[PDB]
Motif scaffolding. Structure first.
Motif, PDB file in Angstrom:
ATOM      1  N   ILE A   1      51.478   2.416  15.228  1.00 53.45           N
ATOM      2  CA  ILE A   1      50.987   3.589  15.947  1.00 53.45           C
ATOM      3  C   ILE A   1      52.092   4.181  16.812  1.00 53.45           C
ATOM      4  N   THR A   2      52.939   3.326  17.380  1.00 53.05           N
ATOM      5  CA  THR A   2      54.035   3.821  18.205  1.00 53.05           C
ATOM      6  C   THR A   2      55.107   4.507  17.360  1.00 53.05           C
ATOM      7  N   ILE A   3      55.430   3.933  16.201  1.00 51.61           N
ATOM      8  CA  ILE A   3      56.475   4.481  15.338  1.00 51.61           C
ATOM      9  C   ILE A   3      56.023   5.795  14.720  1.00 51.61           C
ATOM     10  N   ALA A   4      54.794   5.830  14.206  1.00 48.70           N
ATOM     11  CA  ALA A   4      54.245   7.087  13.719  1.00 48.70           C
ATOM     12  C   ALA A   4      53.871   8.036  14.849  1.00 48.70           C
TER      13      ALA A   4
ATOM     14  N   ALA B   1      63.791   0.013  21.702  1.00 50.68           N
ATOM     15  CA  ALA B   1      63.691  -0.351  23.109  1.00 50.68           C
ATOM     16  C   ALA B   1      62.501   0.322  23.771  1.00 50.68           C
ATOM     17  N   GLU B   2      62.159   1.533  23.332  1.00 52.99           N
ATOM     18  CA  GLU B   2      60.932   2.156  23.803  1.00 52.99           C
ATOM     19  C   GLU B   2      59.708   1.461  23.234  1.00 52.99           C
ATOM     20  N   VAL B   3      59.828   0.918  22.021  1.00 55.08           N
ATOM     21  CA  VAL B   3      58.727   0.179  21.413  1.00 55.08           C
ATOM     22  C   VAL B   3      58.470  -1.105  22.186  1.00 55.08           C
ATOM     23  N   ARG B   4      59.542  -1.815  22.537  1.00 55.70           N
ATOM     24  CA  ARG B   4      59.415  -3.008  23.364  1.00 55.70           C
ATOM     25  C   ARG B   4      59.011  -2.656  24.786  1.00 55.70           C
TER      26      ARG B   4
END
Length: 104
Positions: free
Chosen positions: A22-25, A33-36
């Motif tokens: 959901i974060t990548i899409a 680093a924003e995902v983490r």
DNA sequence: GAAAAGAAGCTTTGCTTAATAATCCATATGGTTATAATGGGAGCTGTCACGGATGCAGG
């Protein structure tokens, strides 16, 4: 939410890479680093393991630093919002009047 | 707070056009001609100065 994700992916995923997916899409070509950052509950190699799954499945890939899904995972997301429209936003999935048009 | 009005978002639809059946037509290829038919033609014609390679010859 991730019920439609993991259900729409035919259970090839878990909830970690579901919300990471959901974060990548969610934003195109974002850094991991924003995902983490938006996944503080998950470890660094846990997020990198989930990206190891999506790269392993070939869905999310790099563009240099880039991180985005492909069209098949995009179809998984659109099916997820499709079933989410079937079960959560029913009248949003509607249809108005249609022209015939001409009569002899 | 009403109400015309114009856009968002669906459809059609008359027109086009690209794919493809049909046809015809250039093109090749070969054959086949049964009397007899027996050595070409422009060659320039008014350089020229050198020069080296043949070329021939007598001692």
């Amino acid at each position: 939410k991730v019920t439609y994700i993991i259900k729409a992916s035919n259970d090839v995923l878990n909830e970690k890479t579901a919300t990471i997916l959901i974060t990548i899409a969610k934003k195109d070509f974002i850094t991991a680093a924003e995902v983490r950052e938006v996944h503080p509950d998950l470890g660094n190699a846990v997020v990198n393991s989930n990206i190891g799954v999506l790269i392993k499945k070939g869905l999310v890939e790099k563009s240099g630093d880039g991180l985005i899904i492909t069209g098949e995972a995009q179809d998984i997301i659109s099916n997820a919002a499709t079933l989410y429209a079937q079960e959560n936003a029913p009248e949003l999935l509607k249809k108005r009047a249609t022209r015939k048009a001409r009569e002899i």
